[PDB]
Symmetry: C2
Subunit: 576 residues, 2 copies
Amino acid sequence: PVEFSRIVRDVERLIAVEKYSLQGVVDGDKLLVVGFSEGSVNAYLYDGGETVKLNREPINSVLDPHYGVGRVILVRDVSKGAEQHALFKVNTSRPGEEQRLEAVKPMRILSGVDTGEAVVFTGATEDRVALYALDGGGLRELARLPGFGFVSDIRGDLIAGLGFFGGGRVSLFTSNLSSGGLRVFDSGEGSFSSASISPGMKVTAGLETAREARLVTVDPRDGSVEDLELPSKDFSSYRPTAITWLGYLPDGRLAVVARREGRSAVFIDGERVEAPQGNHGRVVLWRGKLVTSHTSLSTPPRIVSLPSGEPLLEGGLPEDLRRSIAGSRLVWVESFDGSRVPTYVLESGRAPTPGPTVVLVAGGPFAEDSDSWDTFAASLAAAGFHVVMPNYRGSTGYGEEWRLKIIGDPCGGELEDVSAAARWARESGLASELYIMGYSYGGYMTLCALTMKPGLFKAGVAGASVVDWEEMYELSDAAFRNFIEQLTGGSREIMRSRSPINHVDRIKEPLALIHPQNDSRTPLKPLLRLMGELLARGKTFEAHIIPDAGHAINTMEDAVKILLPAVFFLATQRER
Amino acid sequence: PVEFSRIVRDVERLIAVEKYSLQGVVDGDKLLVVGFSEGSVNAYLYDGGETVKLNREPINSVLDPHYGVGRVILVRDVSKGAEQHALFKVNTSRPGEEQRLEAVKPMRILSGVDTGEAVVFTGATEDRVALYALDGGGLRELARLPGFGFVSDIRGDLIAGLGFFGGGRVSLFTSNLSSGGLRVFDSGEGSFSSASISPGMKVTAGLETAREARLVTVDPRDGSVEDLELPSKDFSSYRPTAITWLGYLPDGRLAVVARREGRSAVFIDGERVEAPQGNHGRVVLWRGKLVTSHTSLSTPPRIVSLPSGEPLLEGGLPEDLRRSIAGSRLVWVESFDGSRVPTYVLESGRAPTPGPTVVLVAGGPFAEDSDSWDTFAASLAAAGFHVVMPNYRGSTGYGEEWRLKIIGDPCGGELEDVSAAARWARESGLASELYIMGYSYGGYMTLCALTMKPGLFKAGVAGASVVDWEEMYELSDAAFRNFIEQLTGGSREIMRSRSPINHVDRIKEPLALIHPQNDSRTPLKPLLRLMGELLARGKTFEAHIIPDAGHAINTMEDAVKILLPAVFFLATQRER
């Protein structure tokens, strides 16, 4: 067959491998890392080499610590997957002892920074997206935001952040920790992707324009925007198309992680710092060393020091799993309007060529398939599927223009891009048969593909999918309502005609639906209706609804429950 | 630390182990066996060193052959699980060459016998249950049956069968191969469970009465019923409570399989024949040898020779799996009205005592938990659960009275019996925590327990369940409609108040639903509505819907798909 237990062995070990992200430096000279480890997402202190777990129960994230703070603020879903987060203070000297910050009622916590004195975060409720501050004086709403907004940085009383305030464009906003308020700075030529407040109290920001990315400095007093000149020209000669992150280190140096073609580079004051190939996260100064996270299509996220590339914290892949990843490459696929779609390809060592191939669209929109570890891809390659990961228009990493092409056109141009990648897989000799697997917006895309292009794929997996923009809209909080509005151009007609529930008649291929029951992003309710329509029309479908879980998986149990049936489904369709 | 891959390895091997049932003897000294082997239900010829697969694709069953016929009639679902069967002739000299008997439209085929000249079977369509004959003269409907009915035996032109024609009682019926018609013979004292036509053209039948079982002779000409006395008294001394099967061997000897307390014995002309402990199936004479099937709670069904107990065809369990079954016993649990519920207990070698215990109700009503192999039970024992298997009222094997107590009272006394067994598991020291898992009527029972006895189990798994008697009834064929009528006493009020869909508000425990999408016995559609109600009320639930599959699983793939989520769910609930 289908060797069920081998698939589970592989899949469970791919989930289990330790994955780390770098969050900052606390209690002077310890690293704060968030890790998938011991079967869950935990927060750890590292001093090189005890690793001390800070939380009891699994968490969802931590707020960004300012350097050397004596505490950590854990963000934990207290609603079984619906992402109503509560905040939990852990004093770094007493790990495992948590104190719920009761002043803040549960809400979808978006981002946040802890200064040591005050906790500043963005959060969404049913009625609003807001910027909040929690200090000794209690909880304050500093400003109501138009849409999704994220805190990037705080310096003194200045708060800087990124707002998604319209048309899919990203604005810079500032507020004040004392008085509050909101100053919004839009750019005419692109979107801001990252921000940090310089010692001079200006905001240095990554600006992503039509094709290129550059650094600018915004004076929040008068809104003047000037190009930031760096003492070294490595950065400008790199020609970056996206900025992952930037930050002023404690010693005043500007650290920038920028990318092109799905791989990043680290720059300090414009000077290129040697880094392992792949993608990098924030950069911290730690014991006079530059530390970052590093990942690639074959390297689970790990903490490395620069420029040596020396691992501080890494999970190692078993060798049999390493061998299953034959290799990766970037190809440029010609789409329907002559656009080239940057597609990452992961060749399985366990499949022939041509071989069964899954087009994997996970996450999105405004996500990117880069040279970064993907558990879905690895687990498909381990199961003997080649993987094609298309950066369809609406993806990030290739400029503002490519990313904005999706706005007002869900299940339009981007679906053509995904189809073009499928076609490329066959025509180039990669794929003997095509499947599509998607999660989130990708799950939405699976349903659009099967409804709009029947015959292209042999079978599809839709995880945590959008099936109806309209009912979803009705069920969404203020952040997601606004995001749907932006995505659809505020057009209720687009909401309707681009909803695959309205084109179920067209489905010819077998489909597996996987949905966490408490998903508050892509709710289950509409999915039940789709299943009724599939049943009434005699369609072949498989469905799996996962209990006490939502869009954000933070345990191995849930991860296995979401991922295993997807792989079993494909493995089984492969034998037919 | 739920070891997913370890459970998968055990469960896939437990499904994979070959399981055989004896069907008869063909072309003239070959055994006809139906086996789960090579991952599917197949028909084989066996001659004592070769096993020859007769079918191409997986089948559901074969019709009973008269000794030595040069063909086999396979019954295969041609509706992807909905159990609309076609019949397929295979000439035993040309295995793998099938010929669909196109004169017979697909229908739910219930039973059948092939004389070599004529194929006689019972079948249910939307509007009728009927006795049919297919000879060279085409298809003929011999008689319309009141409800479920099964052909038992044909001799010359006399057809004998068992009919469920009212009040849960089982009637003997006869018809004629030439003229057709229907003679029905009811007994006042009990139900007929088996029948065979003697050389003298009378019907020998197993009569199951209030407490004991006995053999009678029925003269179809005048309807006289007289006790059959046998030359040997071992059978009467045995005090059997049920008859499994009886048949006249080609030499005129009467073979009887009778059971008591979930274990059978074999008698030839009333004379006990040594047989391996457990349960036995039909008995054939093959090359001057008595051959039967044999199974026990630790022995997957196999073909053995009597009286030696010599295996002819058996799948061997791996050692590790054999040891996981610590032991079994029969206990008598006091129920709510003083009745003793005969419950089989399977102790797991991999659980402590007290230990996590699953009350397993699979199949039913009119089924029995006996000392017979159960893949669900073994696979729970292997995952570290003790298994408790109660013969609630409505079960067979303990007399007519116990079996008929369910009539008009679904989700009543029998649920009390199931709860009493759960209570006993805890009181006696076996169970540290209780779960309930059920399939088919057992699935119904899971839903009844969670709605009617919240807090009794920690969680439940309802597979292929009844959720609404009313909607199911609207979607049922003529056989199931009649059966629902019989079970509910034809009362629309019982249908309504005993449907767990009407009690969803009451569920406090996590619940996993498993359902094949084309189930035509317990349809999916009412399940979708249950899920909507569970969602709307904030209930924790897991659901798996299996594509292209129905109530009767005949492949490994489908079995894994139904069984794996059930075990994973319990194993995960166990860590709490």
